[PDB]
Write a protein that binds this ligand. Sequence first.
Ligand code: DUT
Ligand code: MG
Ligand code: MG
Ligand code: ZN
Ligand code: ZN
Lengths: 114, 263, 43, 559, 159, 141, 133, 49, 196, 112, 65, 85
Amino acid sequence: MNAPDRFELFLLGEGESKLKIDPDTKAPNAVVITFEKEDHTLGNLIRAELLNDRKVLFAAYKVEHPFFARFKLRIQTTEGYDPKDALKNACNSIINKLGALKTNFETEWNLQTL
Amino acid sequence: EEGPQVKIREASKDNVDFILSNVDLAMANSLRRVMIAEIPTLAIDSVEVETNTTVLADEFIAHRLGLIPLQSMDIEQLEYSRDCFCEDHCDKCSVVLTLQAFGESESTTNVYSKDLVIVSNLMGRNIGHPIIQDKEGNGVLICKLRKGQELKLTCVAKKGIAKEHAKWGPAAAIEFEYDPWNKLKHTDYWYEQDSAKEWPQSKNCEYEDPPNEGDPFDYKAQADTFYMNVESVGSIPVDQVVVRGIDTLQKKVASILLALTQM
Amino acid sequence: TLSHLRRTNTPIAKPRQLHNTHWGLVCPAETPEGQACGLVKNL
Amino acid sequence: RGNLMGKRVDFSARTVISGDPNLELDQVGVPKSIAKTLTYPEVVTPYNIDRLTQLVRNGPNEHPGAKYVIRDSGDRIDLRYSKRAGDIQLQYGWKVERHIMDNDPVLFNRQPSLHKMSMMAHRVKVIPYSTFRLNLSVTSPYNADFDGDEMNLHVPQSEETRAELSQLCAVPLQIVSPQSNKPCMGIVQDTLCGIRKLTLRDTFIELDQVLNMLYWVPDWDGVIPTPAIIKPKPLWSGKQILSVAIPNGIHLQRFDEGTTLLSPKDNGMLIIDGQIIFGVVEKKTVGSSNGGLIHVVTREKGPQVCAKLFGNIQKVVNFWLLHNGFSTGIGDTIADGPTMREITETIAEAKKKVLDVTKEAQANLLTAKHGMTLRESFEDNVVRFLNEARDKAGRLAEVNLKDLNNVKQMVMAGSKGSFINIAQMSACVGQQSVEGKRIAFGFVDRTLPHFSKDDYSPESKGFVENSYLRGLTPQEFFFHAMGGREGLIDTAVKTAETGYIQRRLVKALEDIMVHYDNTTRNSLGNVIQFIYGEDGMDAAHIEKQSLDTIGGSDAAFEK
Amino acid sequence: YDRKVPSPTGEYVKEPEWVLETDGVNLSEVMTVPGIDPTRIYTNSFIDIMEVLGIEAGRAALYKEVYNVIASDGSYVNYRHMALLVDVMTTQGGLTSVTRHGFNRSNTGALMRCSFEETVEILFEAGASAELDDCRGVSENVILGQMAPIGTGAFDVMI
Amino acid sequence: EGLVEYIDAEEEESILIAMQPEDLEPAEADVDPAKRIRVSHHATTFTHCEIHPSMILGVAASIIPFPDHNQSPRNTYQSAMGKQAMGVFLTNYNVRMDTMANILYYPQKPLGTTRAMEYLKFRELPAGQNAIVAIACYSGY
Amino acid sequence: SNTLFDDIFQVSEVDPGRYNKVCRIEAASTTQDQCKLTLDINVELFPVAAQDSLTVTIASSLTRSWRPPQAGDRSLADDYDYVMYGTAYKFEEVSKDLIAVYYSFGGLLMRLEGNYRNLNNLKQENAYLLIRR
Amino acid sequence: FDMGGYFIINGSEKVLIAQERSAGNIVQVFKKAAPSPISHVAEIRSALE
Amino acid sequence: ASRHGQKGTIGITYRREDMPFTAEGIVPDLIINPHAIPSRMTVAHLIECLLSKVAALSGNEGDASPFTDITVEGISKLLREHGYQSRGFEVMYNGHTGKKLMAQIFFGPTYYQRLRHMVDDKIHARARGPMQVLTRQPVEGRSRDGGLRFGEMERDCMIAHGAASFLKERLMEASDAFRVHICGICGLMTVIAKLN
Amino acid sequence: QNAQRDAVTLFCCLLRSRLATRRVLQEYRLTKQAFDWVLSNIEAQFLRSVVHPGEMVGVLAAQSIGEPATQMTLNTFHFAGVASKKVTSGVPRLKEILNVAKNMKTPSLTVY
Amino acid sequence: MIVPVRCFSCGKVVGDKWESYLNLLQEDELDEGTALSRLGLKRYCCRRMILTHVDLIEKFLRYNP
Amino acid sequence: EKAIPKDQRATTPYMTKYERARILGTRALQISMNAPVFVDLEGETDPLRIAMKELAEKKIPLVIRRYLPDGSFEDWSVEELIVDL
RNA sequence: AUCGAGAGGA
Ligand SMILES: O=c1ccn([C@H]2C[C@H](O)[C@@H](COP(=O)(O)OP(=O)(O)OP(=O)(O)O)O2)c(=O)[nH]1
Ligand SMILES: [Mg+2]
Ligand SMILES: [Mg+2]
Ligand SMILES: [Zn+2]
Ligand SMILES: [Zn+2]
C-alpha cells in the first residue's frame, strides 16, 4: 500500500530519460553516467567489458539503493580518448559477442536429436 | 565461428544442458539474469468473474489462473497494451480466454486448464494455449466443484516480463557452475578434517583436468567455461528461452547505443 | 484454540516458579512473559 | 501525571522499523503516505514562492505537495476540496501547510525513552514502503532491533523549533555521550563481522573489485592508491582500501596482548594518518569503545565528518561482505572426535571428585569452613567442582574450534556470542540453579519422583551433563526449564523495578542545572556543587589520559 | 587481599594483606579495638558511616557504594553524575532518600512536588499553608505551558 | 485390568517412577558418542513407569521440533508465537461470521514433526510453510 | 630515484603463522654478518622454502593515480619476481651503532636491521620492496 | 475438527478458565516472621464440599 | 517465525535473479542472519533445517520428537548419502555477478510461521484531527485517528537536550493550548470576558 | 580565584607532566613554532571543554544512572557458588541505597 | 486448499501432478520418495511442494451448500 | 537596576550552544517572515542558513540577558560574544 | 461516544 508500482523497474517515467551523462569533478577526463531502469544485468556487463579496453584508466558501477532501478557508472580514460567512445566500443564489443553466442548455439541445437 | 563457444550435452523439450566456453563470467551470469527475468511471454492478467459459488475465494482463483502457462511461441507479434492504440485491449495485443464448469455429477468435478477456451481472434498465430505437458491430457487442476457449484469467468492474457510479476517467467531453474575443482580459489571450503573427502565432487569434474598438488597457484587464470542447464516451464521451447535470452540482452545493450545518439 | 481451552489462572510465597511437582501436570514451557508470568499456566 | 506532565500530541507518527545500509547515519526513511499526512507550516517568501506555488498545485494527493493554504484574515482553504485548488495566487506572508520533504529536521524516538539518546533529530528521506528506515549504527542509543519494534516521530512546527532540533538534538552531535565520556554508537552486526574478515593479512582484493569499492565511497577523491602488491598481479590488501574510508590527520595507537610494533599476531592497532599500518580492525577499534576510532574522529574532525565516517565504513565493508558471503551452520557446533572424549572424561573426573566429597561428608570427616554450616560447605564444594567442570570442558571445545569456524569468527569479531555460548552449545550446559541454590527437593527428600530419597549427586540436583547439540535428557530438560523460568521472572521484575528507580531519580533531580557562574543549583537556588562535577568541565569533552608523574621508580622519574 | 603500595625504590608493588570480613555492623565498637587500623576500616552501611564519622564521610561511602553497583556489574558511568546524585541526597544535612519521604518532602514548589506522588494531599496542605509557588521548577512551567528556564530558555533575547 | 493408573502430585510423593521401560531396566551385562549421556538404573524398586517423557509438555510446546536441543526461555517464546501464527483455524470457516478471520493460502504440514502432532490435528490443519531458508550475510538488509 | 639498499639474504625460517596466503620469513645476508631481515611474503604468488637465497632491494621510483600496467611499452625497476610498495613507520635504534627500520605494505610487515642503512631510508612514505630468484 | 468445551452467549463463543486456589481441610505449619511474637502457626481452611 | 523463538521481520524483497543461488539453481525463499544464531543458542533450529532437508530428499517423515535417538551425526550420514555436504553447507553464487561466494552457506528448508502484526495495521500518522471533549486533547487510538502520547518520560529527554521551545510547542501548539482571562486582584478565572 | 586554582589543579599536573622541558625536547622534539601552536590548541580545546551554562545536569545524571541500571542482570549473581559471598548486588542493592533502607540484607565490616 | 501451481522457490509447474501423485501412492503402492522422483521432481524445493501439501479442499467440499 | 556594568562581568565571553541555537532560531523566524536581511546571500534561500551566515559575520542586532541565581543579569551583544564552540 | 474488563505487541 506504500509499495511503488512494479513497472517502475523497467518503464521510464515521464521526463526521466535512459542516460544522463555528468562531467566528473574529481579526476580529469572522467565521466559519470546514470542509467534509468537498469541493474546488475547491464551495469556488471558493461563494466567488466569496459575493463578489457586498455585505454580505460577507471571503470566502476553501483546501485546506490535497491529500491530504485537507477545505477551509476563512472568511467575514466587516457587523454585523447573520449569516455563516451569507450562506452560505445564497450557496447558494440558485447553485441558482437552475443550475435556470435547466438549463431553458435543455434548451430549446436540443430545438430541434436531428441 | 568467431566468438563465445557452446556445446550441448543433453536436450529435451524441457531441458538443455551445455558447456559454455570462451566467455566472460559477467556475460554468462548477465545472460542467466535476463533468461530468468526479461524475456516476454503471454500470461493471464485480468479475470472477470460472473459466478463463483465454489469453495475458493475469487482472487484466490484469479491468482491461480495467472500462474497457468500459455503458448508464447509467436509472442513477438503481439503488443503491450501500454503501447497498442486500442482502448483497453484488442486481438492485436491480448488474448481472451473463457472458463465454465458446473457441478454435474455426484462425484467431485475437476476443473483443469484444458477447460479454458480461447475466444479472441488469434489471427493465425501460436499464442495462448494453456501448455499441457500432462500425460492424461488435462494440465493444471485450477479448482474443484461439488454438486451444484459453478464457476463462470473471462480471462485476458497479456504480454509481460518476470520483472513485473513472476508469473510471466519462462525460466524454471537454471543450473550454473564454473571451475569445479576450485583451481581459481574463488571459494574457501569449510571443513572438519579434510576438504576433498567431505565435499562431493560435482558431475563436471570429468570435464576438467585434476588440480595437481605439485603445482603453484595459477594467478592469471580466469573464470571461463561455464556448465549450465536451462529448464523451460513450457510457454517457450527451451532452445528459444536461451535464444531470446541472448537476444533480449543484445537488444537492451543496443537501446543504449541508441540512447547515446539522440542526446 | 486448543491452547486456550486448557488454561489455568491463579489470583494475587513463590507462586511463579516452576515447582518440582508440576512435572507431568502443567507444561514447563508454555507460559506468558512479563506481567503475569508463571501465574497463568497451561495443562 | 496524564494530561500535563505528558499528553497526546498532533504531528506525530508511528510504525514498524527496518534497517537500511544505504541510508545516512543521521537520516530516517519515512514511508511516503506518512510524509503526505504530516505537514510543516511555511511562510511565503520571495525565496520560496517558486517552490511553494508549484507545491500548492501538486495538491494533497501527489507527493511533494500541500494541503491547506492559510492567508491573513485567519481563514484556511482546503486543497483537497475547494474549487480554486488548481488556481491560487500566493501572497507574501501567507502560510502553506506543505508536506514533509527530504532533509527536514524531525524528532525520532523509541520507548522506553530513558536517555537523551532515546530522542534524536534526524534528516528526512521520503521513501516507498510502510516502514521507517534507519542506519544500523543508530540502533544502540535507541536500543531497537527489527523484530517488530516500533518507533515514533514528532514534527516541529516552528522555525526555531526546527533550529533547536538540528542544533541540539541532531544525531551527529549525540555520537559522543556525557554518560560515559565515550561514543554511544559504533559499527555492529554484519559490518563489524565483515570489517574483521576484510582486514585479515590474508585478505587481498584484485583490480575489478577494488574499483567498485573505491567508487562506493562518496567522499573518494578519484585516486587509485598504489597496490601493496605490484609483483606478478596487482593486488590490494583489505586494510588498504578500508583506509580510504578513514580521513586525514587521524592517528591511533593500541597494543593488545603480544603486540610488538611487528604484530606477529596482527593484533593491536596502529593507524598513522588516514592509513592503517597493522592490526585487525574489530570491536576495540571501531566499536563504541573509549580510545577508539569513532571517539577520535568525532573529537578531532567534528561530528559531521564522523557521522559520514559510519556511512563510508559500511558502504565498503557491506559491499565487500556481499561478495564474500558469511554464514553459520550446525557444523559450527561440532567438536572434535578426540575433543568429545576429553570433555567427557573431564566431566567424569568432576563426577568422582564430587562422589568423594559426598562420600566424605557422609562419613562425618568433612570439616566446616569457618562461619558456615556443615551442609553449606558441602554445597559450596560441589557447586564449585561443577562450575569448574563446565568451564574447563568449554575451553577444551573453544581451543578445538578452527579459525574457519563461523561461530568463533563472530566471537573474534565481537559481533555476537561469548565463551559461555560455545560452552553450552557444544561441550556442556552445566549446573542449573534457582534461588541461587542448586535444584531444591520439591517432592519430600528428592527433586523429581524418578529419584531415590537423600540423593545429592550432580544429575539429581540440576547438573546437565549434555550440551544443546547432544540434547537434554527428560530430567535435565525439566530442571533447565525450572532455571529458565527463574530468568524470565526477574526480567519481568527488573524492568518494573528499574522503571520506577528511573522515575524517582529523574523526579528528584529534574530542576538541577548549571547556572551562569558554573555553580550547580536547583529551583530554590540551593548550591549543590559549587563547580559542576567539581571541575566545571562537560562530561562529553573528557577522555581517559595517563598521569605520568604517578607510577614508576624514583630513579625512572628523575631520569 | 591484593594491595598496591610504594616500594622503597618508588614504584608501586603487590603487597598482600590480611583483611577481616564481617556479618553484621557495630562500627564504633570494632574500630576502638586494639590491633587494627581505625583509619581504613569500612562498612557498606553508609547509614552508620554517616552516624559515626559524620555527613561527609557518609557522602563518600554513599558514593563508593553506588559506584560499586555500576562497576561490579561491568558498566562504567562518569563520576560527575553519581557525585551529583550523592550530593543531592546529602546537602540537606543527613541522608534524604529518593522517595516520597526523602526529596519530595523538601520545600520546593507545591506544583512540582505534587506531580510526583501523593498528588492531592500535597495540594491540600498547599492551600492550607497558603504556599507561594516560585514557578522556577521545570514542571511548573510544563504545567503552565510556558517556556521552562532551561537550556534554550535559560536566558533572554533582546534588541 | 490394572495395567495403567491415575496419580496426583500427592500420591506422586510415594512412588518410584521409571523413565523408559528399556533404558531403565533390562538388567546388566560399546557406546555411541553422538547420543545424549544417560543417568542410571541406580534404583531398582519401581512402582510405575512414565507413558512417555514428552507428555510433560502442553499443546503449544508440542509443535517445537527438538526442544531438548533449545535453551529453555526460547521454548517459552515459541509457545507465545505459535498462537499468533496464521493457519486454518476451522474447516467450516467459509460459513462462520466473526470479526477477523485469517487463512493461509497454501498451508503446509511441516517437514520435521513430533509424535504429539498426530493427536493435535496439526498436519491436518497446519500453520506454516516449508520455506527454503538460507543463513547468510547478503545485502546487509 | 634510484636504489636505496641492497643485499642477497639467506632464508633461515619460513613460518605460516595461522594464515593461508601469507608467511613471515626470517633471513640474514650472506655478505654481511651483523645484518638480519623479517618479512611478510604472499606465499601464493611467490613461494619461498627454507634456505632460499633471495635478493632484496628498496627504491622510491620505477603520486597521481596508479594506472594499470599497459606495459605495451613500459619500464619499471623490475628485473624481479616479487615486488611490493609500502610506508616506513618506525626507525628504531638498538643502541651503540645498530639501527632497525619497520615497513608496512598495507599490513604485510618488514623489519630490517644493520647500520650502513645510514644516510639512506629517510622518513619517506615511499619505499618499494623488490625480491628476485 | 472442533473440540467443543466452550459456551456460546449472544453468538460469541466463550471459554471458562480454570481457577487455581489452595485446598481446604489440609493442615499446614508455617514458621513466622522474626519481628513477630508468634513463632509458628498451624492452619486449616475447613469448608463443606 | 521459525519455531525456536526466532522472531523478526522482512527488511526487503529481492527478485529471484538478485538472490544467491546454488549450483542446481535452487534459491532461498528466505535469508536470515548468521548473527541471530549463537547468542540465542537455538540449535533445534539448526537441527530442523538439516533434518528437513533429508525429509524433502528421501520423501520421508522428519521426526523431531524430543526425547528420541536421532542425532546430528545420524542425520548427516543420511544427508551425505543423498549427495550433499553432510553439515548442510552448499556452494553458492552471488546473483549480481555470477561470482562464486568465498563462504559456503547453510541452506535447507525450515518450517516458518506467518504471524499477525502486519505493518499496514500499525502505520499511523496524525497531523491534527478529532479532539477529546473534556481535555481538548487529541483523541486516543489509531483506529479513531488519534495522537501519540508524548509522555512525561519523553518530556525528560527533551529537558536533557535543553530544547525548551520545542517542549513548549509540543505542549501547546500541538495538543492543548487555550487562552483565558485572569483577575489582576483575585488571580482567578472569574473574569467574565464580554469580548468583541 | 581560589576555586579557580583548584578546578584546574588536576589538569595542570597532567599539563606539567607532559609539557616539561626534558620531554618537550628529548621525547617529542618540538620547535619554537610547533610549541606555540601546542600552547594554542591546549587553550582553545580547554575552553571548548567547559560545561555550558544552561545544561540541565539534574535530568542528565538520573538518566545516566537509570539507563545502565536497566541493563543489569543476575539479581542473585555468579558469586552464588559460594553460599556466604552473598553481598546484595545489582538492582535490589540500588533499591536499598536509594531508599536509605535501615534494614539491609548484608551488612558488613571490612577490617584492616 | 488445492495443489499450488508452480513451485514457490523455483517456478516449475507442480499443480498438474497432484492426481498422479495420489495414484502412484495408492494404485502402485509406491513411496513418496520414488513417487516424487518418477513425477520428475528432482530439486528438493519442488519436492517439498507436493510432499508437504495438505489438500483441505476435500474437506471444504464436504459442506453441503 | 538591577543590572551589572559592562565591567566586572564574570560570565563566559563565549556563546553557549543554547544561546546560539536560540539566536539562529530567533533570526530564522524573522527572515522566514520577510523581515530584512543584512548579508550578501550567495544564493542561499533557506531562512536558517541565512541566519547562520549573518552569525558568522556578526551582523545580528540581538542582546543576551544572562540571569544570575540572585536575580541580577549581564548583557552581551551577539557581536561581542565569541562563537568558537 | 464514555466507563470498566480482557487479550496481545515491543
Ligand atoms: O552486550 C550485549 C548484550 C546482549 N546482546 C544481545 C544478545 C541477544 O541477542 C539479545 C538478548 O538480550 P535480551 O533478551 O535482553 O534482549 P533481546 O534478545 O534483544 O530481546 P528483546 O529486544 O525482545 O528484549 O541481546 C548484545 O548484542 N550485546
Ligand atoms: Mg538484542
Ligand atoms: Mg524488539
Ligand atoms: Zn490492443
Ligand atoms: Zn522447486
